[PDB]
Write a protein that binds this ligand. Sequence first.
Ligand SMILES: NC(=O)c1ccc[n+]([C@@H]2O[C@H](COP(=O)([O-])OP(=O)(O)OC[C@H]3O[C@@H](n4cnc5c(N)ncnc54)[C@H](OP(=O)(O)O)[C@@H]3O)[C@@H](O)[C@H]2O)c1
Ligand SMILES: O=C(O)/C=C\c1cccc(-c2cccc([N+](=O)[O-])c2)c1
Length: 314
Amino acid sequence: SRILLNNGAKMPILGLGTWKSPPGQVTEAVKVAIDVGYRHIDCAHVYQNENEVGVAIQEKLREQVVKREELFIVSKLWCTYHEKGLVKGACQKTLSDLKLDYLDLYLIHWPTGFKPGKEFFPLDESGNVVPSDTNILDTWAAMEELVDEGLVKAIGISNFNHLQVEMILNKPGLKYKPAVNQIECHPYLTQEKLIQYCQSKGIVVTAYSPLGSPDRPWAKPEDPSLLEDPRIKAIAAKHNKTTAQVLIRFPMQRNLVVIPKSVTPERIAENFKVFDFELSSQDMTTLLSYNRNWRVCALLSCTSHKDYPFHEEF
Ligand SMILES: NC(=O)c1ccc[n+]([C@@H]2O[C@H](COP(=O)([O-])OP(=O)(O)OC[C@H]3O[C@@H](n4cnc5c(N)ncnc54)[C@H](OP(=O)(O)O)[C@@H]3O)[C@@H](O)[C@H]2O)c1
Ligand SMILES: O=C(O)/C=C\c1cccc(-c2cccc([N+](=O)[O-])c2)c1
């Protein structure tokens, strides 16, 4: 149920996602998740709901439903805090909101640094995001300081392409390697090349949007839909599981961590019931065959940023 990280800690392979979880529903979602066995919660400052996630975590700690050492809490440094002098304060704000004294894992959320300020997406008058000039290697050094100050047990990256991962790995004077690269991954975006690269370097990959993010704001009625793909439904039916359960089990069998999001109590519990069946190798290869390089998470406003990650093949 856990995978060993290159910092010596164990990370639960199933966690609860919280992007788009409404602040008035996410406290109950996280409470339910912990009650039904989740021990890993994926958070971020930019999701604007860390305080409410924190209320749930704190209640379960206070009530002694779970011990802090048994939880694995992840958050992420937003793009407007890549400047070295802003990283610690950003981490501290997340810790304060989550009501924790450390994070298990803190990720650089995206490789694209943006101008600091109140706006999460600072724009020029023509709608392009305004970049930061801070080198990602300098942001990484600031992340390393957080480990050395006791604020976080592990550091990692998210949405880094293979050249960007390589840049960190080749950093002069690198002190801590990334423990994790969290990337979009599902049967329509299988990420074979990037996953193999990361795993070969001892970096654990977390798969986000494993269900294809059907609640994404830019969904079109005609878009492909994993949960409605009859081929995936057929594999689920064969195993007497739901399509969502197959979609969650799939990355687990690729030695990935996976973080499905729900605020629906029934689904939170359903999504955790994935440790009692196995997809065959044939099922796995069949699911892999559905790759279409279909990406949920990418923004036009960022496509000219020098560190935009998705121009490269992988
Ligand atoms: N690092 C990054 O840049 C990044 C980017 C995207 C996502 N993430 C992380 O990954 C998490 C997961 O990705 P995601 O939120 O994009 O989407 P997702 O987990 O692929 O899909 C979430 C959607 O699926 C529905 N759902 C969940 N379980 C279901 C089930 N058993 N049956 C039917 N529908 C179900 C949810 O509905 P209800 O909630 O209404 O039940 C919600 O609409 C995020 O929440 C976030 O924590 C990270
Ligand atoms: O960030 C998250 O965890 C959640 C969702 C999300 C969805 C679409 C695009 C981006 C996004 C954010 C910053 C930069 C870029 N980019 O460079 O394409 C995309 C993020």
